[PDB]
Write a protein that binds this ligand. Structure first.
Ligand code: CA
Ligand code: CA
Ligand code: CA
Ligand code: CA
Ligand code: CL
Ligand code: CL
Ligand code: NA
Ligand code: NA
Lengths: 12, 236, 236, 12
């Protein structure tokens, strides 16, 4: 699986 | 809605409590209630909405992948016939996943995106729209797979256009958008070369802008840049 | 019940799929459906029922502890008043936890226990009855706390009496029952000396019986004995 | 927290 990101998760 | 009688501030407070308790279904229901109050969301509130639904849909996607793998194995030659139960249960999880995506897309369409004028809010919501169409595309197999893929692409593309005009190359929203659009190209759109090019160009342009940042912003930006590099290592 | 139209065998098959997908709420609903078919459960089916509800209630207990800790801190002097939201949300999680426990206790009472004649099934179900009353006791504060505690004690005691008469000291059901009853004594009944004595006697009697076991049974029994030893290390 | 065990979890 490629790495994705949730901006909220990154900040929170 | 069942949250219609609760104060907006109380819904936000409870979403934060749910986050601490790792009760992400509750967190999402609280944040949906807050969105439905009709006021725009602050930066922190947008992050709470994103965290909540990412965790809910993340559990569903992980379960769907387990069930889909079992189903595929059952359809290989030499496999003993076990009846409709694997397909039925995969369909059950898939339908619930589609429901969560439709819920998020509905909140963005009614009416978060249309009221979002600042780049930081508009890019955030359009990235979310791309992400949730992408999750729909992961499970799509019928006559609307192409249209779901194009809906994801379109949302990501509008977000990219705004982010390039209005945000610095190190902005974490811009970086996370580029990361996820690159994953879309690699995993959904059968475009690994576009995925690699986007990840590389995004990384290099952010690198050149790091000198402008404070120590705390530098840490935020480099963390997401490492994810781009991690994908490039996987893909090349 | 929503599972009333599904075949018993299909419910069991889907519970196993849900387990593989870590979808424990689904797993519990499938196993509840299977119990409600009215037939007795095999050893494997009892294990599926136990796994499913243990994971569901385990998530609820962990969340309740987070929320209860936040609530207690809010009631210390010097703490800023934040309104009713912490109590309300702790109450929400607590009510859902109580509902799950009541569901399990209801399945045991209608009619798993009354039909369970063999020691392995009867001890298993009575241990479960003790466990779920114990989880109710963890959150109880009102006029029924004493009666909930006595209900847990009674179920554990009947299970202990049967297990001592009918099972060898290394039997994993007997060992897990003694482990959990010892936790009841330490954490619920304010009886740490009884907890320590039970854990020590259970460990020593199992040790003396290990020579009778096959390699695979030896591994099963020693794993649970290590948990007794881990508690004794914590408690002494 | 003291260690407890689910018999099903132990077997499954
Ligand atoms: Ca209001
Ligand atoms: Ca090439
Ligand atoms: Ca039948
Ligand atoms: Ca003493
Ligand atoms: Cl199903
Ligand atoms: Cl609440
Ligand atoms: Na749009
Ligand atoms: Na009883």
């Amino acid at each position: 699986k490629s790495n994705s990101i949730s901006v909220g998760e990154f900040y929170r | 809605g069942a949250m219609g009688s609760m104060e907006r501030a109380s819904l936000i407070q409870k979403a934060k409590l749910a986050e601490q308790a790792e009760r992400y279904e509750d967190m999402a229901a609280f944040m949906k209630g807050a969105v439905e109050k009709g006021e725009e969301l602050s930066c922190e509130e947008r992050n709470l909405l994103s965290v909540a639904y990412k965790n809910v849909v993340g559990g569903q996607r992980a379960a769907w992948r387990v069930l889909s793998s079992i189903e595929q194995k059952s359809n290989e030659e030499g496999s003993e016939e076990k009846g409709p139960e694997v397909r039925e249960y995969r369909e059950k999880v898939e339908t619930e996943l589609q429901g969560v995506c439709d819920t998020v897309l509905g909140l963005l369409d009614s009416h978060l995106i249309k009221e979002a004028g600042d780049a930081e809010s508009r890019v955030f919501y359009l990235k979310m729209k791309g992400d949730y169409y992408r999750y729909l595309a992961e499970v799509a197999t019928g006559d609307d797979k192409k249209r779901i893929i194009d809906s994801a692409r379109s949302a990501y593309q509008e977000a990219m256009d705004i982010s390039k005009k209005e945000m610095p190359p190190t902005n974490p929203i811009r970086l996370g958008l580029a990361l996820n659009f690159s994953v879309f190209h690699y995993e959904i759109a059968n475009s690994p070369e576009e995925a690699i090019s986007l990840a590389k160009t995004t990384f290099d342009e952010a690198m050149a802008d790091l000198h402008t940042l404070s120590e705390d912003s530098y840490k935020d930006s480099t963390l997401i840049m490492q994810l781009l590099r991690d994908n490039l290592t996987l893909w090349t």
